Amino acid sequence: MLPKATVKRIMKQHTDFNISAEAVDELCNMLEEIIKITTEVAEQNARKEGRKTIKARDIKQCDDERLKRKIMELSERTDKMPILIKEMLNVITSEL
Amino acid sequence: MLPKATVKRIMKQHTDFNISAEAVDELCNMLEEIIKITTEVAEQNARKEGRKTIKARDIKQCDDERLKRKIMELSERTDKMPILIKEMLNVITSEL
């Protein structure tokens, strides 16, 4: 589990606002979901190369044209999308 | 700066593979970026409602209808996407 005091400390490096305990909890939940799915994808990537060790190369950025299709296809898998993932995407789309 | 040891410990709850230091560092970079943009978007939602406190409601999901539209429009914005956001989106579109 991630330490809530550390997450809130980092949050307050990006805002002067007060931050509720429930808000910190929700970010921690999203962060844990991110750790989970990145690690699972990284393992799948190490497997494709026959490795049993996750390396930096297993966290990938697809070239812009493939990632553009992959996002467009994702736009139509929202109805069964985990809440934590919808929240992440809401943040990413609200920020850009 | 999240503690890299505890992030790797969370990773190992989801994979049996070894994990290199550089992989842990990469994920930590992603997590720090997520903390930043989630807090920045949260503050904006707090402001829109006249508050100076980030609450759980500011880490939000709209509808599956508005989210679907923003994910479509996100697909046309790869060029302004920082690498860390691209890696997050690659993970999300590779996983589930």
Curated annotation (Swiss-Prot), chains A, B:
UniProt-listed InterPro entries: CBFA_NFYB_domain (IPR003958), Histone-fold (IPR009072), HmfB-like (IPR050004)
Pfam families (alphabetical): CBFD_NFYB_HMF
Coiled coil ranges: none
CDD domains in UniProt: HFD_archaea_histone-like (cd22909)
This protein's record includes keyword Nucleotidyltransferase: no
Keywords: Chromosome, Cytoplasm, DNA-binding
A GO cellular-component term linked to this record: chromosome
A single MF term (Gene Ontology): DNA binding
Site-annotated residues for Interaction with DNA: 12
The keyword DNA-binding is assigned to this record: yes
Gene3D superfamilies in the record: Histone, subunit A (1.10.20.10)
Localization, UniProt: Cytoplasm; Chromosome
Segments of this protein annotated with the region Interaction with DNA: 52-55
Family: Belongs to the archaeal histone HMF family.
Function description: Binds and compact DNA (95 to 150 base pairs) to form nucleosome-like structures that contain positive DNA supercoils. Increases the resistance of DNA to thermal denaturation (in vitro).
Assembly mode: Homodimer. Dimers then assemble into higher oligomers, with the DNA wrapped around the protein core.
NCBIfam families: archaea_histone
Protein name stated in the entry: DNA-binding protein HmvA
Gene name as annotated: hmvA
